[PDB]
Design an enzyme around this catalytic site. Structure first.
Site, PDB file in Angstrom:
ATOM      1  N   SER A 134       0.777  -1.235   0.000  1.00 52.09           N
ATOM      2  CA  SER A 134       0.000   0.000   0.000  1.00 52.09           C
ATOM      3  C   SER A 134       0.813   1.293   0.000  1.00 52.09           C
ATOM      4  O   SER A 134       0.211   2.326  -0.192  1.00 52.09           O
ATOM      5  CB  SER A 134      -0.986   0.003   1.135  1.00 52.09           C
ATOM      6  OG  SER A 134      -1.920  -1.020   1.026  1.00 52.09           O
ATOM      7  N   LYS A 181      -0.052   3.324  -2.987  1.00 52.04           N
ATOM      8  CA  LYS A 181      -1.159   4.282  -2.989  1.00 52.04           C
ATOM      9  C   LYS A 181      -0.644   5.721  -3.097  1.00 52.04           C
ATOM     10  O   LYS A 181      -1.381   6.558  -3.570  1.00 52.04           O
ATOM     11  CB  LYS A 181      -2.045   4.077  -1.749  1.00 52.04           C
ATOM     12  CG  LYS A 181      -2.784   2.727  -1.716  1.00 52.04           C
ATOM     13  CD  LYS A 181      -3.534   2.430  -0.414  1.00 52.04           C
ATOM     14  CE  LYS A 181      -4.477   1.223  -0.493  1.00 52.04           C
ATOM     15  NZ  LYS A 181      -3.809  -0.081  -0.799  1.00 52.04           N
ATOM     16  N   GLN A 239     -10.529  -5.151   1.207  1.00 57.03           N
ATOM     17  CA  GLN A 239     -10.135  -5.859  -0.016  1.00 57.03           C
ATOM     18  C   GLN A 239     -11.360  -6.172  -0.826  1.00 57.03           C
ATOM     19  O   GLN A 239     -12.456  -6.342  -0.273  1.00 57.03           O
ATOM     20  CB  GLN A 239      -9.446  -7.185   0.352  1.00 57.03           C
ATOM     21  CG  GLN A 239      -8.227  -7.057   1.238  1.00 57.03           C
ATOM     22  CD  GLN A 239      -7.625  -8.396   1.642  1.00 57.03           C
ATOM     23  OE1 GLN A 239      -6.765  -8.944   0.929  1.00 57.03           O
ATOM     24  NE2 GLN A 239      -8.029  -8.904   2.790  1.00 57.03           N
ATOM     25  N   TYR A 253     -10.537   2.132   5.738  1.00 55.87           N
ATOM     26  CA  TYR A 253      -9.406   1.895   4.845  1.00 55.87           C
ATOM     27  C   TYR A 253      -9.769   0.844   3.823  1.00 55.87           C
ATOM     28  O   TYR A 253     -10.286  -0.230   4.153  1.00 55.87           O
ATOM     29  CB  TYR A 253      -8.199   1.479   5.666  1.00 55.87           C
ATOM     30  CG  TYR A 253      -6.928   1.257   4.905  1.00 55.87           C
ATOM     31  CD1 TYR A 253      -6.385   2.275   4.134  1.00 55.87           C
ATOM     32  CD2 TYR A 253      -6.188   0.113   5.068  1.00 55.87           C
ATOM     33  CE1 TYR A 253      -5.185   2.103   3.475  1.00 55.87           C
ATOM     34  CE2 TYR A 253      -4.984  -0.069   4.423  1.00 55.87           C
ATOM     35  CZ  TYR A 253      -4.488   0.942   3.638  1.00 55.87           C
ATOM     36  OH  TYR A 253      -3.260   0.783   3.002  1.00 55.87           O
ATOM     37  N   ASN A 289      -8.828  -0.822  -0.256  1.00 55.84           N
ATOM     38  CA  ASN A 289      -8.215  -0.938  -1.567  1.00 55.84           C
ATOM     39  C   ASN A 289      -9.202  -0.706  -2.731  1.00 55.84           C
ATOM     40  O   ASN A 289      -8.895   0.052  -3.642  1.00 55.84           O
ATOM     41  CB  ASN A 289      -7.464  -2.279  -1.686  1.00 55.84           C
ATOM     42  CG  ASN A 289      -6.466  -2.266  -2.801  1.00 55.84           C
ATOM     43  OD1 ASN A 289      -5.467  -1.544  -2.723  1.00 55.84           O
ATOM     44  ND2 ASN A 289      -6.736  -3.021  -3.857  1.00 55.84           N
ATOM     45  N   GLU A 296      -0.579  10.029   4.994  1.00 52.73           N
ATOM     46  CA  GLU A 296      -1.224  10.231   6.285  1.00 52.73           C
ATOM     47  C   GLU A 296      -0.263  11.004   7.162  1.00 52.73           C
ATOM     48  O   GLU A 296       0.915  10.626   7.229  1.00 52.73           O
ATOM     49  CB  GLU A 296      -1.588   8.873   6.917  1.00 52.73           C
ATOM     50  CG  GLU A 296      -2.618   8.088   6.092  1.00 52.73           C
ATOM     51  CD  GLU A 296      -2.749   6.620   6.425  1.00 52.73           C
ATOM     52  OE1 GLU A 296      -2.274   6.206   7.517  1.00 52.73           O
ATOM     53  OE2 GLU A 296      -3.308   5.843   5.631  1.00 52.73           O
ATOM     54  N   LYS A 345       3.404   6.368   5.307  1.00 54.39           N
ATOM     55  CA  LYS A 345       2.521   5.287   4.835  1.00 54.39           C
ATOM     56  C   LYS A 345       3.160   3.946   5.087  1.00 54.39           C
ATOM     57  O   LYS A 345       4.329   3.743   4.784  1.00 54.39           O
ATOM     58  CB  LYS A 345       2.197   5.454   3.325  1.00 54.39           C
ATOM     59  CG  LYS A 345       1.122   4.498   2.822  1.00 54.39           C
ATOM     60  CD  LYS A 345      -0.289   4.874   3.289  1.00 54.39           C
ATOM     61  CE  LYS A 345      -1.285   3.776   2.997  1.00 54.39           C
ATOM     62  NZ  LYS A 345      -1.258   2.619   3.933  1.00 54.39           N
ATOM     63  N   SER A 390       1.934  -3.384   2.954  1.00 53.15           N
ATOM     64  CA  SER A 390       2.135  -4.795   3.205  1.00 53.15           C
ATOM     65  C   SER A 390       1.620  -5.619   2.059  1.00 53.15           C
ATOM     66  O   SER A 390       0.597  -5.304   1.436  1.00 53.15           O
ATOM     67  CB  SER A 390       1.381  -5.168   4.444  1.00 53.15           C
ATOM     68  OG  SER A 390       1.923  -4.479   5.569  1.00 53.15           O
TER      69      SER A 390
END
Ligand SMILES: *[B@@]([O])(O[C][C][O])C1=[C][C]=[C][C]=[C]1
Ligand SMILES: [Cl-]
Length: 363
Positions: free
Chosen positions: A64, A67, A120, A151, A153, A273, A316, A319
C-alpha cells in the site's frame, strides 16, 4: 572526521538489528535522506535459499505504499483539469452511471470515505475488467458518504483507475511511461522486467513459505509497486522537494500534501497520512494500528484543505503477504526514510525502527 558516519551507522544498526531479530526478518533495507544526502544501510538476505544479500538496489514489494504513487498520478490528472475532487465517480466511467457511484465523489474514494467499501475486494472478484465493473455496479454504501473512514483498496483503487480514465490511458501504462520517468525512477516497476528479476527479493510468510504477490483486481493502483530502497528514497526526496521537478509534476506531488480531515492524531491526504511532529511513539503506533486499518472511524472534516508541510510527519505503511514497508518524511526538517523488509511484520515494529532513527537524529 569518521564520527558522523560511525554515529549514523551505530544509530541505524541499533534501531534495526533488534527488530529484525525479534520479527525474524530475513532481509531489510534502510534509506535515509538527511541534510540533502542519501544514506543506505542494508541487512541480511534477499533470498535465504540462494544467499543473495540485500542491497540498496534490491527490489521489494511495497504494498500500500503504492497508494502514494497512485495519488501522484491522480494529482497530475487534477492539476491538469482532467478531473476534480468533487466530481461524481460515475462522471469518469459510464459503466457506473446509474449506480450508487452517481453520489460518491472522487475525494471520498481517495480518502476511504465513500461509505464502507471494504479493505479488499472479495475473493470472488478476480483481476478482470468485467468482474470489477460488476462489483462496483452492485455495491451499496453502509453509511453516508463523507462520514466515516474505512481503509479500502477498492476505494482508492477506483480513484486511481478513474484518474487514468480521465487521462485517456490505462493506469499501468501511465505509471510506466509517464509517472516513473518523470520522478527519475528506473528501478521502480509494476511488472518487474525479466532482466531485473535477479534483484527481486523473496518474500517470507508463516513457516517461511515463499511469497511474492500475485495478480488481483486493481493491484497496480492499490499495492502493485516493486522498488528498491534507493528508488523509494528518490521518491521521498521528490516529495521533500517538488520544486526540483518540472512544474506539472511538481504540482502533482503538491496535490498529495493536502489534508482533508482528521481521525484522532492523523490527518488524511491523498495517499499520505500526516501527524504533528514531534508526537509520541505510542501515538504514531496507534495511528498505524490494526484498528485503523480494519475498523470505521468518524471523520472530523477540515474547513478547508490543509497544507501538509512544516513540522509534520507524513507516512505510509505497505504490506503484502510476504513484505512489509514503511515510509516517513518530515517536510520541515528535510528528512526522509524508507524501511523495506521481506517479511510482513507488525506495523508497530516498523514505526519503532523509524522512531528510533528519527529520535537519534534529534538527540
Ligand atoms: B496495503 O498494503 O495496506 C496495508 C498496510 O497499511 C493493502 C491494503 C489492502 C489490500 C492490499 C494491500
Ligand atoms: Cl484488494
Amino acid at each position: 572526521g569518521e564520527a558522523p558516519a560511525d554515529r549514523l551507522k551505530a544509530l541505524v544498526d541499533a534501531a534495526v538489528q533488534p527488530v529484525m531479530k525479534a520479527n525474524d526478518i530475513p532481509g531489510l533495507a534502510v534509506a535515509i535522506s538527511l541534510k540533502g544526502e542519501p544514506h543506505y544501510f542494508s541487512y541480511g538476505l534477499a533470498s535465504k535459499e540462494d544467499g543473495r544479500r540485500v542491497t540498496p538496489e534490491t527490489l521489494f514489494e511495497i504494498g500500500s505504499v503504492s497508494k502514494t504513487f497512485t495519488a501522484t498520478l491522480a494529482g497530475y490528472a487534477l492539476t491538469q483539469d482532467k478531473m476534480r475532487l468533487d466530481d461524481r465517480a460515475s462522471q469518469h466511467w459510464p459503466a457506473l452511471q446509474g449506480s450508487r457511484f452517481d453520489g460518491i465523489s472522487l475525494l471520498d474514494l481517495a480518502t476511504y470515505t465513500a461509505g464502507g467499501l471494504p479493505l479488499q475486494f472479495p475473493d470472488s472478484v478476480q483481476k478482470d475488467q468485467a468482474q470489477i465493473r460488476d462489483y462496483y455496479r452492485q455495491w451499496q454504501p453502509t453509511y453516508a458518504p463523507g462520514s466515516q473512514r474505512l481503509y479500502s483498496n477498492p476505494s482508492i483503487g477506483l480513484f486511481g483507475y478513474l484518474a487514468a480514465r480521465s487521462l485517456g490511458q490505462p493506469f499501468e501504462r501511465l505509471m510506466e511511461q509517464q509517472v516513473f520517468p518523470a520522478l527519475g525512477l528506473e528501478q521502480t516497476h509494476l511488472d518487474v522486467p525479466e532482466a531485473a528479476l535477479a534483484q527481486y527479493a523473496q518474500g517470507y510468510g508463516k513457516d517461511d513459505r515463499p511469497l511474492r504477490v500475485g495478480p488481483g483486481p486493481l493491484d497496480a493502483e492499490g499495492y502493485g509497486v516493486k522498488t528498491s530502497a534507493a528508488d523509494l528514497l528518490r521518491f521521498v526526496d521528490a516529495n521533500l522537494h517538488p520544486e526540483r521537478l518540472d512544474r506539472p509534476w511538481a504540482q502533482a506531488l503538491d496535490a498529495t500534501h493536502r489534508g482533508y480531515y482528521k481521525v484522532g492524531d492523523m490527518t488524511q491526504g491523498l495517499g499520505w497520512e500526516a501527524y504533528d511532529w514531534p508526537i509520541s511513539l505510542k501515538r504514531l503506533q496507534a495511528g498505524n494500528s490494526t484498528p485503523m486499518a480494519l475498523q470505521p472511524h468518524r471523520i472530523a472534516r477540515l474547513p478547508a484543505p490543509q497544507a501538509l508541510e512544516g513540522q509534520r510527519l507524513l507516512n505510509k505503511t505497505g504490506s503484502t503477504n510476504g513484505f512489509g514497508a514503511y515510509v516517513a518524511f518530515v517536510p520541515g526538517r528535510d528528512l526522509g526514510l524508507v524501511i523495506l523488509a521481506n517479511r510482513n511484520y507488525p506495523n508497530a515494529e516498523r514505526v519503532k525502527i523509524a522512531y528510533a532513527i528519527l529520535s537519534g537524529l534529534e538527540q
